[PDB]
Each structure stands twice: as C-alpha cells, then as structure tokens.
Amino acid sequence: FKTTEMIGYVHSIDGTIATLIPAPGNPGVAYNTIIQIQVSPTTFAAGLVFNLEKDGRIGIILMDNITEVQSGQKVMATGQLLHIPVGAGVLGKVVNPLGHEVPVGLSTLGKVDTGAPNIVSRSPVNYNLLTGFKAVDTMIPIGRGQRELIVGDRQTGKTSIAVSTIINQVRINQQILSKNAVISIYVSIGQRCSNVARIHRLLQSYGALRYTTVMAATAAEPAGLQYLAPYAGVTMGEYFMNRGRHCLCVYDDLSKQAVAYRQISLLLRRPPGREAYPGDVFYLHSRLLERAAMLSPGKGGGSVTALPIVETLSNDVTAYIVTNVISITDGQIYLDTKLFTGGQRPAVNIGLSVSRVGSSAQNAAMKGVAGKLKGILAEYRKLAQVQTIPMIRGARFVALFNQKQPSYFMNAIVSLYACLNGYLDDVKVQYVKFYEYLLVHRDLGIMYGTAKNKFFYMYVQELNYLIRFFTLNSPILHGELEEMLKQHTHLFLQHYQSKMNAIKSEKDVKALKNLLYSCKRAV
Amino acid sequence: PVADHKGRVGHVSQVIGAVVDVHFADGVPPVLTALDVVDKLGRDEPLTLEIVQHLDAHTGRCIAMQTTDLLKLKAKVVSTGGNISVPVGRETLGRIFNVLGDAIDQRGPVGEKLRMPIHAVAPKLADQAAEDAVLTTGIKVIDLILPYCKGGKIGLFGGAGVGKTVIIMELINNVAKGHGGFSVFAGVGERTREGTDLYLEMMQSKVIDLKGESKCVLVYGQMNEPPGARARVAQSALTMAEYFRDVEGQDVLLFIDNIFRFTQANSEVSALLGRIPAAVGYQPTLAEDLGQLQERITSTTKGSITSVQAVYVPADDITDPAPATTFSHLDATTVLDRAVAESGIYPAVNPLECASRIMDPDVISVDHYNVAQDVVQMLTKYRELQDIIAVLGIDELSEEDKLIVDRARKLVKFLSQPFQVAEVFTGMTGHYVQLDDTIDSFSGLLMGTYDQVPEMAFYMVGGINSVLEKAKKMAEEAAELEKMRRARV
Amino acid sequence: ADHKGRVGHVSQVIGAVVDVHFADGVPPVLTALDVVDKLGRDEPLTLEIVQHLDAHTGRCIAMQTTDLLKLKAKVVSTGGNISVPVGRETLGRIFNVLGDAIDQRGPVGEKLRMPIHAVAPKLADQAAEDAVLTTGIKVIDLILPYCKGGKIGLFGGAGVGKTVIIMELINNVAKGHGGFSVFAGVGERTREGTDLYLEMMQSKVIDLKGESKCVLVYGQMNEPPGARARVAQSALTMAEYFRDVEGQDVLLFIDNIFRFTQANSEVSALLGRIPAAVGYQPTLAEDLGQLQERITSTTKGSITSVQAVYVPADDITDPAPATTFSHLDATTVLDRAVAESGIYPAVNPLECASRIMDPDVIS
Amino acid sequence: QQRTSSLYNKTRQFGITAALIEILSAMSSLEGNAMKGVRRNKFWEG
Amino acid sequence: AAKKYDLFGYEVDTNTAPWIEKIKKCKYYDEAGEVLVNMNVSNCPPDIATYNATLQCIYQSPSKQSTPVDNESKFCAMMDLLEEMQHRNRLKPNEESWTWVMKECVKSGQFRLGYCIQQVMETECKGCPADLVKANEANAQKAKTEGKEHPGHLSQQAGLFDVKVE
Ligand SMILES: Nc1ncnc2c1ncn2[C@@H]1O[C@H](COP(=O)(O)OP(=O)(O)OP(=O)(O)O)[C@@H](O)[C@H]1O
Ligand SMILES: Nc1ncnc2c1ncn2[C@@H]1O[C@H](COP(=O)(O)OP(=O)(O)OP(=O)(O)O)[C@@H](O)[C@H]1O
Ligand SMILES: [Mg+2]
Ligand SMILES: [Mg+2]
C-alpha cells in the first residue's frame, strides 16, 4: 500500500475497532478507504475507515496485526479503496482478504467495492455446472452464474460437497478449451486452520490448484478479515467474469461472516436487531451474492457461480440468517442430519432442495434422463410388502445416489439410464454398488468375449462429449447402449449375483462384506 | 417559478455509513431537498443526497442514494432547488428506471414532457372512491375465499421461498397482459435476475413493444442498491402510478415486490440517524412511514389503482412489527404458510388466516358468499379435529367426524392448482379456473355428491371436470392393476 | 521490551476494572502491570491491560480483589504479557494464572518463562496427515478413536468415574507415547480440586518423591473473572512448551470449557460491551477460536485436548455449546445407566462420535 | 414432546435476548440524554 | 451483413473477418479460445465460419499449450465447441465441422470414435468421405491384428473375490 500523508494518531482501541484523532490541520481521510498504522519503524497494520466524525475523529476497523496496535501511533492514508491482486498469477495460492500470500508447508488489481451487474447486464443461465453427484445433477440442476445455497447441520458434508464440486472440474478443464474451464475460489470464513490445511492437501492431491485459489480467514483471525473475506473472494472471481470466463466462488461460510459482522456492530454500540444481529445484516449478504451473475452476451457472457454455505440448528430452517440467505439465493441443497447419520450420504434431502433457475441450464441428456426420475422419486416418497415397479426403481435410485467422490458425467448418466430402464430390477439392493463398479470400471462383455458393440464401451471416456451432444436416446447411441447394458446385466446375474447368493461360510460372508464396503466407497 | 434555494452551496460536515451531514452557510434548504456533490472525489458515479432532518439552522442530515465511498469532509455540495423528481407521462412506457428516474435500459433518451417530485400528499377524504367489484384472477383459492377487488389494495404475506413471487407472476400473466389500462412494476430489494426475467417476459409477450406502444413501466431498486435507494424507489414508482391515475384517469396496476424491504431500508437508515429503536429494532416511525406510503396507493374519483404487494415475513414470524403493521393497509390479505408448501400444496395459502373486504353478499353473489362461508367452516372444524387426530388417531373419532375429515381433506387437496408459470416445478400444464366453475365445483363437493371420487383426484387439478378426468384415469389404472393381479391366479 | 518497568498511576477503580494513567504512554494491550503499593493487601495485585482509552490512559482487569486500592497508586509494568514457568520442573506442581506454586512445596526453580498469549500455529505448521492417538482403552481406540491435535468433548457429570478415566488417560499417554499432561481447572470447585489432587497423588501420577507426569493449573470460582479467563491460556502455554521444545504428544484437560466461556462473558460485561444473543459476549466465537486454534498437531509435536463440556439448561442449541461443538473432533459420552450395569468405563458406544472414523484416516 | 421442547428452548432464548436488548436500549437512551458540561479546570496550566 | 440482435434487442457486431484472420495465425489451439473470448467480450459473437476456423486450428495445432497438459484431447475440445455452438448458440454444424472431427479421429488413431462420427455424419450430412472411412478401417484392422482392439486389463478373467476394487 502506498502512503500519502499522516492523517492523525491512534487514540482508543476497543478489541478489533479503533478511533483516531486528527493530525494538525485535519488533512482528512476519504470514507471507506484503507489506512496504514505504523506499528513499527518498518511495518504497518491495515485498517478500514468506517466513520468520519464532525470533531475530526476517524473510526477504524483494524484488519491485521491488531496485537501490535497501540494508542499514539501515527496513521497514514493511502487515499484509495482496498485493491487486491487478481489474475492467473494467484491461482494455486493461499491468500488472505488483504491479498497477502499465506505460506504453505511443503499484476492486475481488483476493487473489493464494485457494484453488481445491472438489469440489462444479465442473461438467463444456459450452461450447466456439474457437481459430480447424481442427486444434485439430476434433481437439483445448477447453471453457471447461479447462487445455490447449501444448508444443513454441523458435520453433514456441507464443505465436502463443495470441495468435491471444485475437484470435479479438474478432468473437464484438462480436456475442453481453457475458455470454458471453470476456475474456483474457495473462501474459508471463521473455519479451523487444520481444516484449511486438509482441504488444501485434498485439492493438491487431485491437481485442482492449477484452477483453484484458497482465501482463508481462520477463527483465530480478527473479525475484520472474517467480515471482509467473501468480498475479496468474489472480487477475485469477478476478474474472470468480466473477461468471458466462468468462476465457482464458494463461501464457507456466511453464518460465521454474519457473526463477525454482528461482533463488529455490537463493539460499535449499534441498535441490535432480531437475535442481536444488526439491522443491515441482510444487506451484508445482499451486496455480496448480487455480484455473482451471468453476464449478457454484450458483456462477454462470463459467469460467477456462488455456493454459499449455511449451518442450521436441529434442522431449523426458520432462523433469521438462514431465511435471509434463502431469500437471496436461487435455490438450496438441504442436507438432512437424519439421512447423513443413517449412512445415506451425501444426504441430499431432495424433498426440500430446489433449483429455481437451474432447470434451463441442465444438459439435454441429463434433462431427458432426469425427467422421469422426478416422477419415480415422487411416487417412491408417497409409497413410504407390495413392491411395484416404481418402488423397485426408486430403491435402486436411492442406492445409486450413495457417493463419496464426484462421478464423471458419462458414468453417472449411464448408470442412471440403466436403472431407469429396469436393468437393475433383478439386481439386489445391496449389490447395486458392485453392479455399478463392474459397469463403469470393468467390462463383462470383453472379459467373456461376448461383446458386439462397435464403439460404445465404458472404457472409452471420449464418448462423454458425444453423449452430451445429442442424448442417450438418440438412434446413434441408443442401440449400442441397450446392447451393452443387456449384456452386462445378463453376465452379472449369471456369474456374480448367483455366486453371491450362495455364500454361507462366515469367512466368505466377511469377504463379501469387505467387497461391498470397498465398492460403496469407490463408485 | 424557481426555488429560492437552488444553487445553495454547502460542505460535508460528517459522514457515517449512508448518512451525511451538510452545513450550509446561508441556511439549510427545506427537508426532502435533493443535493448533488460537486467534488470529483475520484468516484465512478455521481452522488446525490436527500435531506431528511434539520440539525440546526445551518446543518442538515441527509441520506445518500449511491455508495458514499471516497467521500471526504468539506466536500462541496450544491442544492438542486427541489425534491427528487421523476419522469411522468406516456414517454415512460416500456422503459426501465431507477430511484433517481434515470433510464437504465441503455436505450434512447426518455424525453419526458415534465417531471414530478416523488414525495406528494395523499388523496383527501373527499377524493375517495366508493366502487366495489371483483377481480377474477383464475386461482381457485383467491377467487373463492379471499376474492380481490378492482382498484383495491392486496397483500401477499410469506416467508422465504414460499411462493410470493410465483403468485405475483401468475397474477401478472392472468391480469396485466389482458389489461386495458397501464401497469407499473416496482422492484424493491429483490433479485436483479428476476427483473431481467420479467423484462424478457414482457418483451416476448409484446407487453413492452419497444418498436410500438408499450403499456408498462419498470422501476427497480434491488438488493445490491444501498439503503437510500431502496427507501425511495417505491415512492418514485408510486409517483408514476399517481400521474397515470390522475392526469389521465387511467386504470393502473401497481405490482410492488417486496414492500418489506422498504421498511427494512427505513430501519437501516434510522439506525444511523441516531434514533432510539422500537421493539425488535425497527425505527420508531415504522407505522407513520407505511401510512404515508400506503395512503397514496388508493383509488380516487379520477382513476383507479389496483395494487398487489408482496410482504416478506422474517424468520416466518408473522407477528413481526413490519408485516404486522401492513395488515391494516390492505383490502385483501393472502397469508402463505411454509408447512402447507412442504406438504406439496401450491399455492400455500392458509385460508383460515386470509381475509377479504368484498366478502359481502352486497358485493359478491349470494351463492359465492354461502359457498365460501361453508368452506371456511369446514376447514375450521377440520383444523379443530386435527388436534385430536394427531394424538390418538383417526379411528378415535365419531362417525360423522370421519365424514367431515374426508370432505375437508378433499377440500384441502382441491384448493391446490398448477400455475401456468410453475410448469417447470410442477411438470404439469397450468390451469385457469373460471369464477363460476370454482363456485359450482366447491358447492357440489360440499353437498357430498363427490364422496365416491378418490381423495387424490382433487390434487393439482383445475375445475371439477379435471377432477373427474383424473379420477377416471386413476380408475382405469386401478382396473388394469386388478386385472393383472387376477390373471396371476 | 522498551516498556519494562514503566511507571503509571491508578486513575479509576470501578469493581474489577481499573484504569491506569501512564505519563510515557500506555504499554501494549494484554500487558501485565504490578501494583507496587501493598499497603494493607494480603496478596499482590496485578492488572492486565485490555483496552486503551487514550494515548496515556489504559483500562485493565484485576486478577485479584481490588480492595484498599486508592487513586494515584503507583503501578509498574512487568515488561510484557503475563509470564508462566514452562519446563520439566513444573511436573507434579499446582499453579495459578500468574504461574505461582500454590502447593507450598518449595520454589519451582524454572529456567524459562513464556507469555500467556501466543499466536496460534501458522497454516504452514499444520501436520501433514491425521494420526490416531492410541489411548490404550478398547472402547475409545475402537469406536471413537482420538486424533493427535484434536479436541474431544467429554460429556457426563460426576458419578460416572470421570476422574478415573482422566487419570487413566494421563497414565496411558505417558506410558505409550511418552507425552506429559496438563490439567486446567476453570471455575472449578475448590473441594473437587483438592479431591483430584489427592487422587492423583494416590495413583502415583503425581509422585512427590519420584517423577510426576501431570501439571495442575487451578483457577477457582472464588477468584475474580479475570483469572478464570486466563487460567486455561496459562495451561495451554505450558502444554505448548512441551509440544514445541520437546516435540511430544501432550494432553490438555479443561474442566470445564463452559466455565471459560462464562468467565470471558463476565469480563466482557464488566467492560460494558453489549452482549450478543442469549447474553454471551459479542466476541464469543473469537474467544473460543483464539484458544482452540492453539490446540492442534504441528510438525514438531501435538496437543490433544480432552475438554469436559457442560450444556446449560439441557439446551444443545445454546450459543455456548453450539459454538463449542464447532471445534470438537470427537465426543465421549458417559452415562450413569452404563455405570450402574457394572460396565467400566461407563461409555455409551452408540452415543459417541468421531470424525476420523473414515478409511482415509484409519486402517 | 420433541417439538414442544424445541419451541420451549427457542422461546426462552428469544425472551432472554429481547429482555436484554430492551434493558440496553433503555440504558443507551439514558446515556444519550446526558450532556457533558463545560470543564472548570486550568486549561492554560498545561 | 444483415442487422443482428441479442436477447435484449441490442444491435450486435457482425464483422467476424478480422477475428478469423487472427485465429488463422495461432500456433497452439488454446490461443484460439482466447480469440473467441475476445470476440464475445467485444460484442461480436462467433458464427459458423469462426467455429470452423477454430476447429481447423485445433486439428492443425501441435498441442493445447507450449507445455503438455495431463489429459490433452483434441476430440474433447472439438466436441465441446460443437456442443457450445449447437445448444448455446443455435447453429447447426455443417459438413465441414464434422469432416474436421472425423479427420481428427482418424489422425489420432481412435478408430472406435470414427465409427460414431461416421454414423453421425451420415445421419446429418449426405455422407462421409470414403478416404476417411478407409483410413479409419485401416486403423481398426491394424489395432485388431496387434491385439490392441481393447485394453489388456479388461480381457483378464476375474471372479467374485478376484476383483481388485482398489
Ligand atoms: N459423500 C460422503 N461420503 C462419505 N463421507 C462423507 C461424505 N461427505 C462427507 N463425508 C465425511 O463426513 C464428515 C463431515 O464432512 P464435512 O467436513 O464436509 O462436513 P461439514 O458440513 O463441513 O462440517 P463442519 O461444520 O465440521 O465443517 C467428514 O469425515 C467427511 O469425510
Ligand atoms: N405455485 C407454485 N407451484 C409450484 N412450485 C411453487 C409454487 N410457488 C412456489 N413454488 C416453489 O417455491 C420456490 C420459491 O418460490 P418464489 O420464487 O415465489 O419464492 P418467494 O415467496 O418469492 O421467496 P423469496 O423471494 O424470499 O425467495 C419456487 O422456485 C418453486 O420451486
Ligand atoms: Mg466444513
Ligand atoms: Mg421472491
């Protein structure tokens, strides 16, 4: 930061807030600008101006190095709003809301106070953003430029789903042109430093750092950084939006930002509102989530897909902050605690989840497959021993929704199509994961020399973009799809399920259980 | 004439949030006066202030319509010589405006004949109208239990994601498109994408013919806007509606979404003005602001304004001061409940908590009134019985109580309807039920002539004919299943 | 460092809040001051700077009673934050917030001291991978295994052998991992502190004539809220010394973590800050963050904390337990019914939980 | 029973918060009305 | 030449000739995407000719970038671009685009995709050139003779408990 002149001295320090007194002549400080407090002869501490009093005392919100801020220290004014580095030189790095790089154990600038696109600067979402989960991609379409909320209780996969969604883009980005590559900005707000390290290692393992940047504001950090982190993150994401590219900014999580802002407001002695929150807590998130949009073709067509996360208490979705966020986003992915603890993960409560604008962006193939799945699931919920066709397919679908890692588009859609057309009717519910693993990774037809298809094989990952083009029901890819599905089902029922139904030895039962555990965790 | 304070020079004395105090050497201009900041300040957009209080004979407290970033003390400010004025007339039709009345659609200049201030006095007693009519919306619940009145004030109360916006869009499609008069859509603190969707829908349906004659005006101050603009966009839109009503004697439709954000913005600015908060934390002048705003939304002897307003209920707390104060300012009240929505019933109207002013035999037909009253009584008794049912069970009821329960369940299912705008979410073609058809169907259902029809036949359908067709299809499916089971022997 | 021995004078005394005026400028916040005037006091008085009122006046919180305290009373800065003795000489001894041996067992004879307030480990110091902490107990090791650097929520009050489990953990961690333990009594009954000390001396975990494997840091209820809000940090600093200098897997017991929150809330209330919802201090999240974040597994060693959690009014959604659960990595629930059935340790296996129960971490 | 217990907990928390906010609002109103008078001290002696 | 408009009715640029020339002088086909991004930002949406030029650049370029990417795939990029222009722009690919895709398929040696591309071209276009079909058949026969028709690991027999889930 470039200093211009002294504008006063530090007078009082009440936690994370401070007040300055004017320098001789009252040079003046521009409102909402960044000021530097000379804590040492060579080091400075960032501060944000929030109040210009008549007497000449400036209200400051300390950002970093609060422990080294003392009354009487000189304060210099930069004269400009907060700007942070943005571009391709920040991808793969861990930064803080002030733009400083965070060391990790082995030159464009962006304004963090920019307005959102206006009414005629937007367009309907038309490009899907795949999350890699069958439930979300089918029943909860997410289009690029959409704000999708992720609500749920503590320890229910709220962070895991978003991290997997970021990871799911690695394979796609490496194949298609760089213009369509989806970049990610994971913003951690008030989380634990160990959790940030684990997330960083997980992203690095899958090579997602080339297309991802992490902004961290741990719980030990003051409220200013936590309150400012999401704005800096979206600012980093808006760089690609204004240049015809797409981003996937993620906020983990807005609840802690609200707590930090409430702390700041109460330290300033402002009228508390509902649940002691400030009156403008809604505006806090409004000015944030509004900046994520899908630009119109005239502006380039860039996008910023927001995935705000919110934590509820006892599955209470009538909280002040939860309802406020639900009133801003374009949907919600509710993660029920009962499903999660019951072994049904990611535990997406499809009944309460919804996508208000993502329906159009859904791909034609996924849209075609997902149309009937909606009715099947709706009937299955109402029906829950007479087992009709809807009940069998509903049970198989619920079994298939169990995932740990994001699934490639071709594998997920092929498995969903096979289940929808009744190819898993004879397959027992407990063997659905093993059946899917054999379908995706192995190839029974080739193994037993009974393959007739010319090109349609699951080992040909190149077919994903051909399936995405027309449909799974096109006359080009329909006959071979049906042939391979029939052969796989026949071979499975003949060889694998028949033997699995004839296991009584205790050792063999343990081996079968271990096999099922392994399959359930790997496709 | 020219104001005696136009061009008056003042200097910024204090800046706190969106509240700025300006000192005038020659005297503070009148309250509500619009001021412009002349200093460049390196800003990207101009800055405008509205006077809301007088601190002394020289200092005045103002609210900024744009962000106050890069605003220094002693910054020069010049009075505009009057309140904030917005364009009026037919030149505004088909255009998109903001709080200040600037066209934001990136099209040619408005070229309005004149402008009028956003702040105006409400109509007096002698100017009130005495006309009562029925506005057919095509929705069974509204047309039956809480019928809307032409030229009246309507409100939709609901939580987050309950269906307020969907009902507004359905009403727009079913009324505004086939409306003789003009329409004004005032977006207050709502999603900006919704404004774009509404604009595209209007253009596609030729409601806004940029190459021809349009019949709608869009005024939008959205969530991203600062609290200053969200407390005056409603005033500007209502000023345009008032001009259409009075200066032309034209029937107008005023769709406000959401009116709660107006009170919220007023509370936010009041917190900075240095006022003692009322209960919950709203400004002490909550009732007065709503009274001044709503009293202007009325039908006079010159024209008519049918206003539909969406009221947001924070945390689903219907007792909150903001929504609570709005009830007294509405002719028709539509209360939406989250629990009803979670049960698959859309719209989620809670008929027992809804009310209408034209629910009077002197206004609506006698048969309509009798059917509505019978339905309400049945629903009330069923709600009373549900308390016993949820504890002991249905089998612990009287013989006639079971009949009441079955009829009330069919009524609850029947009240649902698929909207033509929610086809994506419902996956079914929307229905438009005539007023007479609704009355006849509900009267028949009350008599009990449809006791044989399955309960689910009434779920997500239109009139009685749709119920019978769905029942026939269900009967055919059941017969097929029975034939398959019998052949299995 | 430049403010070592700086002179100041008391300017205001309102209960436990004392304002000190320095002619040369207030020392840095969180600085320990000593009241040189012991005219009639039976104990020394020490103040902690919490806020700066102006360039010369600073607000402080007293660690003892402020009785017989006059205005303009001389005060001398200690040169920095509160200092606590750290080393192998503190094993088997009882300390207070100020790091003074209250066991009347001779001088501590420490070789070094550390400040109470230390920044949490940086993101670069975090452990490469999660590791299990073998406690030696079949139930814990199997169903709810502990992780190095993790926080365990110990539910279930007295009557379920909670102290016995604590002593067993202290013994097992030293037996297997060779790491010491630090027990912090925050707002604890003095009688229960004496009982725990006697039990530890009886079980030889604190051997007066031999080698002890536990440090006791007690902040009792009768002490003012200024001490109950820093005893935990003193114990954590003692644990951090072993974690860093000696590179061990240390244990840190907190009894209770709710008392820490209550003490911080009271301290904030005294300063006049507006309480948040329910009535806890507005910095409730930050107060717990500045403490829990210091408990982690670094590249040198680790500190696994077993914190006894109390749920006020049996409301699991209360801000205190709700905020606390966001930092817990495991949960050990103790039930009286299990104890009455003759099962010891009285652990309800189906009520416990752990996050490392994942193949990616454990075998 | 579970639903009523949840409502009971929620209601008590809201009541405590509302009462505390009301008391603090009254205190702030009392503090605001207070005005700092002219200081009668030897300003020159400094 | 004729006036063109976007969703809001605002006039849109149509002079795409300079951008095609810029695409023609790209060494790595990842630079072609940048040109398309610049076109979109400059309110000059690509047309059928621009997409054909981009496909030609992809076919004729050595690799995606100067440094190798982990999973470079020209076919994936071509299909993604075709899906874009078809679904998100409403432009039917002409015979030129499918011929470029088939040329890429036969050049890389992915004969199995050649069958699907040939069927697609026959269904949409009048027919596929015999030269490309002959080259694809030659590649398939060469693969079959060497026994490389399918991956080796897929042909291995594995019973119920002999499957390595891994
Ligand atoms: N789909 C899944 N399959 C299996 N395990 C999962 C899945 N999703 C999450 N988990 C596991 O569940 C646990 C909790 O997940 P996660 O950390 O994402 O939750 P959270 O909502 O972020 O909770 P917190 O409040 O602690 O951040 C972790 O051990 C994680 O590995
Ligand atoms: N009549 C309806 N039929 C079917 N689904 C509906 C209907 N009304 C609402 N919904 C569902 O509820 C969702 C939210 O509806 P809507 O946009 O009207 O919310 P709202 O009341 O405006 O809330 P907020 O604006 O605060 O988010 C819709 O996306 C849709 O899934
Ligand atoms: Mg998480
Ligand atoms: Mg809405």
TrEMBL record, chain D:
Transmembrane segments: none annotated. It is found in: Membrane. It comes from the Eukaryota. Belongs to the ATPase gamma chain family. This is ATP synthase gamma subunit. It comes from Trypanosoma brucei brucei. The lineage of its organism: Eukaryota, Discoba, Euglenozoa, Kinetoplastea, Metakinetoplastina. The chain holds residues 256 to 301 of 305 of the full protein.
